[PDB]
Nucleic acid binder design. Sequence first.
RNA 1: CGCGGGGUGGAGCAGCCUGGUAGCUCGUCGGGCUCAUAACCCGAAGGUCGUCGGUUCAAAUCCGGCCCCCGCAACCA
RNA 2: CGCGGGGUGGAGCAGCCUGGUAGCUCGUCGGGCUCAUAACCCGAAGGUCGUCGGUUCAAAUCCGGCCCCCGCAACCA
RNA 3: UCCCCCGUGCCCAUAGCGGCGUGGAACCACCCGUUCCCAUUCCGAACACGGAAGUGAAACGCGCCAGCGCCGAUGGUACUGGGCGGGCGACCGCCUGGGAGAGUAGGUCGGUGCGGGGGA
RNA 4: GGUCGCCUCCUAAAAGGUAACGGAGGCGCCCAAAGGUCCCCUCAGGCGGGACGGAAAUCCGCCGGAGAGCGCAAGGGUAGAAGGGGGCCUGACUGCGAGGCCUGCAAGCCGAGCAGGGGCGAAAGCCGGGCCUAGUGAACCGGUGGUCCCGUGUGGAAGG
RNA 5: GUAGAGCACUGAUAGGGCUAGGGGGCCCACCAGCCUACCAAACCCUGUCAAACUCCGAAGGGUCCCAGGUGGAGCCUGGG
Lengths: 181, 141, 84, 53, 110
Amino acid sequence: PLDLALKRKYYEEVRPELIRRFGYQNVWEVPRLEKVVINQGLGEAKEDARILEKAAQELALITGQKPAVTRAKKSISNFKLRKGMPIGLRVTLRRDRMWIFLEKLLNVALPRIRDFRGLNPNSFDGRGNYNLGLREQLIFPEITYDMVDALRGMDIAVVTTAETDEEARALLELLGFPFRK
Amino acid sequence: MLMPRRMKYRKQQRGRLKGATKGGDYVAFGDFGLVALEPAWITAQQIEAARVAMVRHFRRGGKIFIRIFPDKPYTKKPLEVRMGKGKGNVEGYVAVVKPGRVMFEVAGVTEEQAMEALRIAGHKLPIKTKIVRRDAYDEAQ
Amino acid sequence: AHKKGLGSTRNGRDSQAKRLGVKRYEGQVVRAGNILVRQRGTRFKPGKNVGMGRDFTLFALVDGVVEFQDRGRLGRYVHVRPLA
Amino acid sequence: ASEVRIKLLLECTECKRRNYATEKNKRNTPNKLELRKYCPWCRKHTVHREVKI
Amino acid sequence: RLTAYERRKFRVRNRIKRTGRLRLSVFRSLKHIYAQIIDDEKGVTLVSASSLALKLKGNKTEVARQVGRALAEKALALGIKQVAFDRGPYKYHGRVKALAEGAREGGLEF
RNA sequence: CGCGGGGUGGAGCAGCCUGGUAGCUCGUCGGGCUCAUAACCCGAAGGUCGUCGGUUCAAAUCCGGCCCCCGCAACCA
RNA sequence: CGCGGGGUGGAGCAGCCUGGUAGCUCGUCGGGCUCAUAACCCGAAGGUCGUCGGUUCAAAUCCGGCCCCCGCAACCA
RNA sequence: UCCCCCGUGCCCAUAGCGGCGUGGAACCACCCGUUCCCAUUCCGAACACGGAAGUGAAACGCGCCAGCGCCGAUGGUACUGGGCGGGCGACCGCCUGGGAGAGUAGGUCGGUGCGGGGGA
RNA sequence: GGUCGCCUCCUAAAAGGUAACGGAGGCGCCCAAAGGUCCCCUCAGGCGGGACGGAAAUCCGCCGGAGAGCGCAAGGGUAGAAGGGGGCCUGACUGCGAGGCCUGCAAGCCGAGCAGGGGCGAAAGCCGGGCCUAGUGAACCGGUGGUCCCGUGUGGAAGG
RNA sequence: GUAGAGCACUGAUAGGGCUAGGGGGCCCACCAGCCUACCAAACCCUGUCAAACUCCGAAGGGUCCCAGGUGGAGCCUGGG
Ligand SMILES: CN(CC[C@H](N)CC(=O)N[C@H]1C=C[C@H](n2ccc(N)nc2=O)O[C@@H]1C(=O)O)C(=N)N
Ligand SMILES: [Mg+2]
Ligand SMILES: [Mg+2]
Ligand SMILES: [Mg+2]
Ligand SMILES: [Mg+2]
Ligand SMILES: [Mg+2]
Ligand SMILES: [Mg+2]
Ligand SMILES: [Mg+2]
Ligand SMILES: [Mg+2]
Ligand SMILES: [Mg+2]
Ligand SMILES: [Mg+2]
Ligand SMILES: [Mg+2]
Ligand SMILES: [Mg+2]
Ligand SMILES: [Mg+2]
Ligand SMILES: [Mg+2]
Ligand SMILES: [Mg+2]
Ligand SMILES: [Mg+2]
Ligand SMILES: [Mg+2]
Ligand SMILES: [Mg+2]
Ligand SMILES: [Mg+2]
Ligand SMILES: [Mg+2]
Ligand SMILES: [Mg+2]
Ligand SMILES: [Mg+2]
Ligand SMILES: [Mg+2]
Ligand SMILES: [Mg+2]
Ligand SMILES: [Mg+2]
Ligand SMILES: [Mg+2]
Ligand SMILES: [Mg+2]
Ligand SMILES: [Mg+2]
Ligand SMILES: [Mg+2]
Ligand SMILES: [Mg+2]
Ligand SMILES: [Mg+2]
Ligand SMILES: [Mg+2]
Ligand SMILES: [Mg+2]
Ligand SMILES: [Mg+2]
Ligand SMILES: [Mg+2]
Ligand SMILES: [Mg+2]
Ligand SMILES: [Mg+2]
Ligand SMILES: [Mg+2]
Ligand SMILES: [Mg+2]
Ligand SMILES: [Mg+2]
Ligand SMILES: [Mg+2]
Ligand SMILES: [Mg+2]
Ligand SMILES: [Mg+2]
Ligand SMILES: [Mg+2]
Ligand SMILES: [Mg+2]
Ligand SMILES: [Mg+2]
Ligand SMILES: [Mg+2]
Ligand SMILES: [Mg+2]
Ligand SMILES: [Mg+2]
Ligand SMILES: [Mg+2]
Ligand SMILES: [Mg+2]
Ligand SMILES: [Mg+2]
Ligand SMILES: [Mg+2]
Ligand SMILES: [Mg+2]
Ligand SMILES: [Mg+2]
Ligand SMILES: [Mg+2]
Ligand SMILES: [Mg+2]
Ligand SMILES: [Mg+2]
Ligand SMILES: [Mg+2]
Ligand SMILES: [Mg+2]
Ligand SMILES: [Mg+2]
Ligand SMILES: [Mg+2]
Ligand SMILES: [Mg+2]
Ligand SMILES: [Mg+2]
Ligand SMILES: [Mg+2]
Ligand SMILES: [Mg+2]
Ligand SMILES: [Mg+2]
Ligand SMILES: [Mg+2]
Ligand SMILES: [Mg+2]
Ligand SMILES: [Mg+2]
Ligand SMILES: [Mg+2]
Ligand SMILES: [Zn+2]
């Protein structure tokens, strides 16, 4: 639906090594992406100042989409929450917008962190998904420096039709994931 | 003593006591048990009383089981007060007991020795009693 | 004497009885309008020819005969099979 | 009612006679009320407001 | 346990059922669209006009508009005027919409 | 049993009604003054608010029950 | 329900009476002096003159609505 | 007129959960795209249209068995409407119609009604 | 000393009803959205994952029939919505009311349908406030606004 | 929706198994060893208690239809 080189890498390289690996029969049951929910749960503009969306504009420059907000589930005295305050943001990346994001993180952004050292491998789901997080925000130079302010990061899940954590790894590793172990 | 550590309501109604027991009609843990022959309100101070008795009978030994637990609150008006102006106050707790219920049963000791420590146990009890033996019938439910 | 310096209670009340329940029993011939059933909640549901007011009071919508049907997991229903 | 919850008669405009009355809050929304209400007097629908009770 | 899909059915389904007037169920797959008039008392079908039996093809929406008009003729000739519209778990729009507007103009009554 | 009162940094007092708000005075520890001590001047330290459980998103606070303290009737002809 | 007068710095507050600068003394930091603590002397801090809204070259002073507290006068089936 | 799918009820878990197999010929689902109508507090996930390359892997349809769920008698007992009895009292017992709950033996991976399509 | 009206549960003995200075708890309000409707969504919770970030902030995954929610107490009810989100809205209309619940009286309660004129919806339809059951007061005496009915010889005005 | 009975829900509950936490060890005291005739949540087993708990549930009671029922029955309007 767009000429992206990771869409083409998954097909013309990643698809087959998997069929030769776990020896699939049918074609659909082969592991495959689904979404990349990016949670910028800030929790710092609750009854705190405006400026919340001042990240949800850079969040758009990362993900191409406009992020939509998330509200306070329930009130907590220890966090200063009343049932309704906004705390964080979340963009769901489906179709080719999803791809092109990873075609910038996996081979430009991930190395843009100092003291970087691969990825944590225990953190796979159990029914075939994976996630972690990030703190530094200009980790993609679409977010240039003299957009300077308080640095905040994101929680990021990636969702796949993988059926176990095992085969799952094989996908994410094959699409360029540096694993720490 | 034996208060139920917590409870849903505090003052409990009185209640009748019609007929024969509901359950607890067979030995289940010990090899000899003590059996009620007439309805009663056995008290936290009696259960305790009968228990301690046997323990001090075969000092260091045996395993005492206790099948009825005093949950009902025994209520009672003070002295030199007349009828009404509230419902009585709680003093002590009790366990409803119909005939046939087992209350104590001991496991593992000389047949003589259990047959005493359950005999003495009955005298601390406000009712008539019969000691019984674990049974084919007992293992049959 | 006898009365002295005791006290009393903190509780002691009760509400006016509401006289609810099933007002019309199955096979009773009804005019349109008769309250078939008084209730809190929906222990009975509005069947054929039967309405329900903002207190779940079910009422005959046309003359006929009350009929009763327990359709299990989707509950009891009250209808009226209008003798034509 | 109490004091924060005021009582009021719904005013009018298209004939200036009152025809309704109800309740509202002045610590919540401290303005002048708003409802469409057909009248037995003008025999037409009209937008209404308020005055004290 | 239930899917949002089947809930929406019951929901949209339940209401209409309470008004007694006849029922023009609208089923719709990615290929064809079907419909059938139902008395829900006895539990029976009055008349059924579908895209597949009519062997029509040539754009899904415009396909349906005829199948709707087809249903009206096949029912007017039977005596049905009064019939309320069941729109399934589908938003009344486009395809289902067409079926209606077809049935509508064919002389049918809702 | 019953009425109503107050329990809070070591002593003595606010903060309770109106639910997010530890206050004052001594006292204390640590710096000066003075040959020395106090006085006196200068900084700091110090309590899950009787206690179980309670309701609120939270309890000094709103809330029920024994544990205390305190006036407190109990007429008994 | 009806009539008297009002907020101006955080308090207090005449200015307002009379149409021209937002102000007296109380409170802070600072300097003075200081046995200290005083009072004293210098200085700045500080405000939107209940609110709109209006007559005017102009308004704290003047008019309308209102608002909010003080008060007064009655009435309460 | 038997068979198979699709729609839709009726029954209310003996129908369900989980498991093994399974069917794309037709229907159905995924599916192809996001121009158009329609849609997302972000996203064509859903809802929406335009189609038809692939696929029955998912979902679903149909078969299989009792691990769970669930239905679960007969016999007997509890209690009991009516009528009586012996006890100083506590409470027990008898005739007479009625008769559970638990538990045992067991049952169950459904039965169906009109309409439509498609091969005997 | 405590109590006095209304609501919830129990006592109350399987229709209703039922006492006690019997065991327990709540009301004297609240909301122009918490109302109307048309549309869409489905919980509490538990295990794995999750930069800050924790027992619980927001996130992802399977798991789950209702144990969450429904303004406040309790009960019944309830996702096949009564709960959560949005679009348009004001029926929180008027003129009436068959028939019934309850019932000593007076009260209270439920209400299809007809007219008028609106709202939301393509529509079948639904709306005479709120999931329901508390959130209150007879008659008398007055206040305010309409009407244009009475008004002491007639017309006014006073007064009803 | 009661007697009974039951534990599916709100709670109680005694022994046992499992098992977060907590406590005594003690290795050691920087993090960490994971060992416990001690306490103990959630859960599983045996075994039980409840007016304001009910997965279930009698006899019975209510009431409408039909039939029997001529009774100091019944029904309406009135006077005491
Ligand atoms: C005693 N009196 C006068 C009252 C009578 N005429 C006489 C008398 O004896 N009265 C007393 C008589 C009994 C009364 N009393 C006491 C106990 C009780 N349980 N109930 C009573 O009525 O208390 C009375 C009381 O003090 O008035 C005075 N001191 N004035
Ligand atoms: Mg392209
Ligand atoms: Mg969420
Ligand atoms: Mg005795
Ligand atoms: Mg009291
Ligand atoms: Mg009563
Ligand atoms: Mg009364
Ligand atoms: Mg239902
Ligand atoms: Mg009016
Ligand atoms: Mg049918
Ligand atoms: Mg005090
Ligand atoms: Mg303070
Ligand atoms: Mg010296
Ligand atoms: Mg000093
Ligand atoms: Mg109190
Ligand atoms: Mg005056
Ligand atoms: Mg002024
Ligand atoms: Mg100025
Ligand atoms: Mg049926
Ligand atoms: Mg199997
Ligand atoms: Mg097989
Ligand atoms: Mg195979
Ligand atoms: Mg297959
Ligand atoms: Mg195939
Ligand atoms: Mg939408
Ligand atoms: Mg959506
Ligand atoms: Mg078969
Ligand atoms: Mg097997
Ligand atoms: Mg089985
Ligand atoms: Mg039997
Ligand atoms: Mg018998
Ligand atoms: Mg009889
Ligand atoms: Mg008898
Ligand atoms: Mg006897
Ligand atoms: Mg078997
Ligand atoms: Mg099966
Ligand atoms: Mg064929
Ligand atoms: Mg009655
Ligand atoms: Mg609304
Ligand atoms: Mg959702
Ligand atoms: Mg959740
Ligand atoms: Mg996080
Ligand atoms: Mg968290
Ligand atoms: Mg409830
Ligand atoms: Mg709703
Ligand atoms: Mg809604
Ligand atoms: Mg809205
Ligand atoms: Mg519109
Ligand atoms: Mg009428
Ligand atoms: Mg009338
Ligand atoms: Mg009437
Ligand atoms: Mg009456
Ligand atoms: Mg109406
Ligand atoms: Mg209400
Ligand atoms: Mg509503
Ligand atoms: Mg009410
Ligand atoms: Mg009153
Ligand atoms: Mg009078
Ligand atoms: Mg008047
Ligand atoms: Mg007047
Ligand atoms: Mg005149
Ligand atoms: Mg223990
Ligand atoms: Mg340790
Ligand atoms: Mg070990
Ligand atoms: Mg061990
Ligand atoms: Mg347990
Ligand atoms: Mg018992
Ligand atoms: Mg009971
Ligand atoms: Mg039950
Ligand atoms: Mg019966
Ligand atoms: Mg009747
Ligand atoms: Mg008479
Ligand atoms: Zn008018």
